[PDB]
Design a protein around this nucleic acid. Structure first.
Ligand SMILES: Nc1ncnc2c1ncn2[C@@H]1O[C@H](C[C@@H](N)CC[C@H](N)C(=O)O)[C@@H](O)[C@H]1O
Ligand SMILES: Nc1ncnc2c1ncn2[C@@H]1O[C@H](C[C@@H](N)CC[C@H](N)C(=O)O)[C@@H](O)[C@H]1O
Lengths: 246, 246
DNA sequence: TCACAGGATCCTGTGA
DNA sequence: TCACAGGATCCTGTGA
């Protein structure tokens, strides 16, 4: 139940409790997928979408690389737990070539495996005093053994077109919380998502949305109310982890 | 790829993408140079010109000062993040003596490191609740290790005599935008620059001009059209950052 | 004088 | 108890 890469917000753990609610579908849509904690572990076909083209091209790529391919690039850069400059180079190189395979290595050495990218589309995460380890290849493998049941998409959720008959799984940025990618989020976003989430219901299209109603101080009222029109399955400084669905 | 001093409009970041277009030259001309983000980082010889003699004399000066020289003047004024009056003094002193080294310290405590000067030639930037920090000396050093490949000029661009064989790099005030130094700018200026920029072309002299075609709602049509006669390499509330060149 | 890009890490679940 | 993998923030410098 591993994700292809370590990823902030990943769901490895909750998938179990999360599948217990999944309806049937002709296509599984992972609207916001990042880590692929879900996609790599649901029943095909899977439309894995995420707005971050870098991470999505990185997947498209990975499909044909091999663990050796990977190991090679590392040896070639002589990267390791304390290789700060070797890192900074690999960064520059990515930034220039925009070669997906390189992003995949970097993510292994970033500060807390963060994959942060800027306006200009550059990888800017600071060194993280780390490199690959056991799970590295396990993650690597697991990806390669399951990605063939996936189709990758890199569109704003509001553009993925949902067909009638597929199941949509939403796990977007949590308003109240703050991971890096919340830079792509706002209330105006929480809104369109929630309104369109409605649309999908009227079209008799089943959906599943994981999020937090309260975390660390503030609360998501907009959804706290919206959440009524549909179900709920509370899961939780205490943050209330829920699964709002139909 | 640091500039000698923090500076509004600086190009630290775009230099990379900007060098990828630089032609060959016997002399690099930095027509409008302020921050020295470019000059300090191109291949000598470099004719760094800027109209603001204060900032230019400040450089001519700096050539012989030492980080200690610098630190000294600070200690001597007991300046720091909250030293508002100590600041105001250092200001007066500059205003009176017109001693370049002092301007260099001030710039470190100005509101947003602005180096604003008036008709009477006085430093008038308000206190900025700040003083030196890490980058201060880095900036300081980088200047001192590269300035020897530079010749400083403080003339209106329309006078900086261009020789046949050098490359001219233009990055003047952006019409549509408004930094302090746009006080030296106008359409009549955009014009002379553009017309003379033509002249340089006819003389078979290569030139490079960074600017914005559109920012914050308005647009620079005069150049939007003029920009056709030559190349373009779009880089970008969205502002369109471009590099018009031959 | 705040909005923003960008260098930074301990606290924690978990196999041993 | 113990080592290791893994992350829904942090602070500081900076200003078209
Ligand atoms: N407008 C948007 N459209 C699509 N994806 C977005 C948007 N804003 C943010 N995201 C992505 O939404 C994701 C949120 C994550 N918590 C998804 C986690 C994922 N299901 C996992 O378990 O690995 C990230 O991968 C973000 O890059
Ligand atoms: N007529 C003029 N002649 C020469 N310089 C001028 C004139 N009007 C304005 N300037 C200067 O042109 C500059 C525009 C700046 N954006 C140059 C930035 C510089 N390339 C840097 O990145 O540090 C300022 O330093 C202004 O002081």
């Amino acid at each position: 139940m591993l994700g292809a890469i370590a990823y902030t917000g990943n769901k490895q753990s909750l998938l179990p409790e999360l599948k217990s609610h999944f309806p049937k579908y002709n296509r599984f849509v992972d609207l916001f997928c990042g880590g692929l904690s879900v996609s790599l572990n649901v029943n095909g076909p899977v439309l894995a979408n995420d707005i971050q083209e870098p991470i999505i091209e990185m997947y498209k790529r990975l499909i044909n690389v091999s663990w050796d391919d990977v190991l090679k690039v590392i040896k070639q850069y002589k990267l390791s737990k304390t290789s700060k400059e070797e890192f900074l180079k690999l960064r520059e190189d990515y930034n220039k070539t925009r070669d997906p395979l390189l992003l995949y290595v970097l993510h292994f050495h970033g500060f807390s495996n963060m994959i942060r990218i800027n306006d200009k589309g550059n990888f800017t995460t600071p060194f993280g005093k780390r490199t690959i380890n056991k799970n590295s290849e396990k993650r690597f493998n697991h990806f390669k053994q399951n990605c063939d049941k996936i189709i990758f998409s890199s569109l704003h959720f509001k553009d993925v077109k949902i067909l009638d008959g597929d199941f949509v799984y939403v796990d977007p940025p949590y308003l109240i919380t703050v991971a890096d990618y919340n830079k792509f989020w706002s209330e105006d976003e929480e809104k369109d998502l929630l309104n369109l989430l409605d649309s999908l219901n009227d079209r008799g299209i089943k959906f599943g949305l994981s999020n937090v109603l309260e975390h660390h101080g503030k609360e998501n009222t907009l959804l706290k109310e919206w959440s009524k029109k549909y179900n709920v399955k509370h899961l939780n400084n205490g943050t209330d982890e829920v699964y709002i669905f139909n």
